[PDB]
Design a protein around this nucleic acid. Structure first.
Lengths: 77, 70, 72, 73, 79, 90
RNA sequence: CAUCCGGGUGUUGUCUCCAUAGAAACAGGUAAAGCUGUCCGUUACUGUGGGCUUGCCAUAUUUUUUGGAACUUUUC
């Protein structure tokens, strides 16, 4: 009965997410936790300049996923 | 964390209050709460001008409370 | 013991005027008598007025922004 | 879940904070509130440096974590 | 958990701390709590401007406690 | 339990009421950037998935300059959501 | 002080019965052994099946995860 359950299906996806501090991090998703703790692999983080980190990991404003994902098929239980 | 702290040794004692906004007031701590709200008698704020009032202080905005006399 | 819930019940039956402070805005003030309340620090202030001594004229307050409740 | 935090256990990481500091040091513990304790701490306000030792930073103050080096043996 | 009991095993020694206010105090610990509450004696407060001060007894807040410092010999304590 | 009865009767019932008809919603966010898109699914915290997102925001460098941005999908957490407007077309 | 009747643990060897293909193949050496090198049996990424060492077991309304944030300006 939550949108957090479909977000665990968002694993392996690339997401350029914004934060409450307001940084930019483009990277592939590893896993999604029930409290929104997300793990990123092969990431491109930006604040300052853009700086690459490999294993990037409540402040997330929204993850802007790619348009290649069909949303209604994942939006079912 | 329903266990309230132990201000019972300072109850009915003089206080030097620390609060939000750089606020301080002197008064005798009459009662305590689970959330750290206090009850002060002989309310007198710390401006330099000290106006007597004669006070139920809110808990969260307060930072700490000191002792005038040891 | 004088608990912060046991004191607030005397303010409603006594009908005393009480001044309300701000969460992070000390420049504003509050006033009025509280008829009833709730468990979360909800307040229904009667004769509601906003506190340089420009007193501006029931109100309902959120407990998260309450700072102090002092009788008198 | 909590499978991801334990696999970093006994590893040196860089954890950015909400204030902007990034303390670096090996991971000793992890908690359900995001509370982590670290050993050999070095804060970087920015060209600068600071030496503390063992610190346990809270879950409120944390922004993220990123591992700097692999596990030491 | 290890982050809460690790502070209770440091009691009696001195630890440093950080605030959301920004200033730090230092003093030997009298009590801890599951909230991250604090209790010391003989604090050495220091603001960001650097004004030194004295505070005898101080109780602290769990949310307002930002990042604390523990004794280095307490790193061999078992969890 | 009791969240199901308030889901149709509450103010979130119009989020179903506009979201069922495919109406657009103009949402004023916490970043000082109002959001315009078409909603798909929401939750009790107001974590909403938009389609064809359009933001509007001023700037300085200084004079006022507005800018727009097109987003395909954006599952934005409800904590930044500060005012949601069910503005219907008809 | 001895003798005598008995005992435990370890190791290698041997005998008996059962099983077998298996790479139980090769070479170094000690008081003992895969003690050591090569070596192979399943085989390290998947799907079906078993078990748990497991996720802690589900809190938007005050001390951590549903925001007291947003925005402006000067001094170096």
């Amino acid at each position: 009965m939550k949108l957090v359950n479909f977000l665990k299906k968002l694993r392996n996806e690339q997401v350029t997410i914004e934060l409450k501090n307001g940084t930019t991090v483009w990277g592939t998703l590893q896993s999604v936790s029930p409290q929104m703790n997300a793990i990123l692999t092969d990431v491109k983080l930006t604040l300052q300049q853009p700086t690459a980190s490999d294993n990037i990991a409540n402040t997330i404003r929204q993850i802007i996923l790619p348009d290649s994902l069909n949303l209604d098929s994942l939006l079912v239980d | 964390m329903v266990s309230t702290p132990e201000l019972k040794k300072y109850m009915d004692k003089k206080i030097l209050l620390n609060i939000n906004g750089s606020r301080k007031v002197a008064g005798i701590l009459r009662g305590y709460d689970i959330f750290l709200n206090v009850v002060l008698d002989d309310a007198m704020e710390i401006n330099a001008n000290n106006h007597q009032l004669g006070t139920v202080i809110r808990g969260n905005s307060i930072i700490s409370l000191e002792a005038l006399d040891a | 013991m004088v608990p912060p819930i046991n004191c607030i019940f005397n303010f409603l039956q006594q009908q005393t005027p009480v001044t309300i402070w701000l969460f992070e805005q000390i420049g504003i003030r509050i006033k009025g008598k509280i008829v009833g309340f709730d468990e979360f620090m909800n307040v229904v202030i009667d004769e509601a007025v906003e506190i340089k001594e420009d007193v501006e004229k029931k109100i309902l307050l959120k407990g998260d922004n309450i700072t102090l409740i002092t009788s008198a | 879940h909590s499978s991801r935090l334990a696999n970093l256990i006994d590893y040196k990481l860089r954890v950015l904070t909400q204030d902007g500091r990034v303390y670096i040091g090996q991971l000793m513990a992890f908690d359900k509130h995001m509370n982590l304790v670290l050993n050999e701490c070095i804060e970087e306000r920015v060209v600068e440096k600071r030496v503390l030792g063992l610190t346990i930073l809270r879950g409120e103050q944390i922004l993220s974590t990123v591992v700097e080096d692999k596990p030491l043996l | 958990g290890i982050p809460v009991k690790l502070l209770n095993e440091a009691q009696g020694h001195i630890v440093s701390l950080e605030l959301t206010t920004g200033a730090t105090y230092r003093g030997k610990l009298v009590e801890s709590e599951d909230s991250m509450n604090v209790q010391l004696r003989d604090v050495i407060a220091t603001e960001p401007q650097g004004a030194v001060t004295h505070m005898d007894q101080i109780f602290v807040r769990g949310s307002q406690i930002k990042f604390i410092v523990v004794p280095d010999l307490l790193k061999n304590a078992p969890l | 339990e009791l969240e199901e009865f308030e889901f149709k009767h509450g103010p979130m019932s119009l989020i179903n009421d506009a979201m069922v008809t495919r109406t657009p919603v103009i949402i004023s966010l916490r970043n000082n950037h109002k959001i315009i898109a078409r909603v798909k699914a929401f939750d009790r915290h107001c974590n909403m998935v938009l389609e064809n997102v359009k933001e509007l925001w001023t700037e300085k460098k200084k004079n006022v300059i507005n800018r727009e941005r097109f987003i395909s999908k954006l599952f934005l957490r409800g904590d930044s959501v500060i005012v949601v407007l069910k503005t219907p077309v008809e």
